[PDB]
Amino acid sequence: LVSKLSQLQTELMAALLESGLSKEALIQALGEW
Amino acid sequence: LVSKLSQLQTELMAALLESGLSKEALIQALGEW
C-alpha cells in the first residue's frame, strides 16, 4: 500500500533525528519553501 | 576534519529533499524543539 519511497523517507528522517540532527539543519531545509 | 557523521547527515538531508521530501515532514521533525 504505502510506497517504498514514503517508507524510506520516514525511516531516514527518523534515523537522522536520532543521530543528533540539528534544528538548524531542519530550518535550512524548511527554507526551500 | 569534518566528521563522517556530519558529512553523512548533510548528504542524507540533501538526497531526501531531492527525492521530494515534504515540508510537512520537516515541520513535524522541527517540532521536536
Swiss-Prot record, chains A, B:
This chain belongs to the protein called Hepatocyte nuclear factor 1-alpha
Q: How does it assemble?
A: Binds DNA as a dimer. Heterotetramer with PCBD1; formed by a dimer of dimers. Interacts with PCBD1. Interacts with BHLHE41. Interacts with NR5A2. Interacts with SPOP; this interaction promotes ubiquitination and degradation of HNF1A.
Phenotype when inactivated?
Mice are born at less than half of the expected frequency. Neonates are slightly smaller than normal and do not grow normally. After 5 weeks mice weigh only 50 to 60% as much as their littermates. Mice develop non-insulin-dependent diabetes mellitus (NIDDM) 2 weeks after birth. Mice exhibit elevated levels of blood glucose, combined with reduced blood levels of insulin and insulin-like growth factor I (IGFI). Males and females are sterile.
Stretch list, region Dimerization: 1-31
Tell me the protein family, please.
Answer: Belongs to the HNF1 homeobox family.
Full-protein residues shown: 1 to 33 of 628
Where in or outside the cell it occurs: the entry states: Nucleus
Q: How is it modified after translation?
A: Ubiquitinated in s SPOP-dependent manner; leading to prteasomal degradation.
- Cited function: Transcriptional activator that regulates the tissue specific expression of multiple genes, especially in pancreatic islet cells and in liver. Binds to the inverted palindrome 5'-GTTAATNATTAAC-3'. Activates the transcription of CYP1A2, CYP2E1 and CYP3A11.
Per UniProt, residues of the HNF-p1 domain are 1-32
Q: In which tissues is it expressed?
A: Liver.
Q: Which domain of life is it from?
A: Eukaryota
Origin species, per record, is Mus musculus (Mouse)
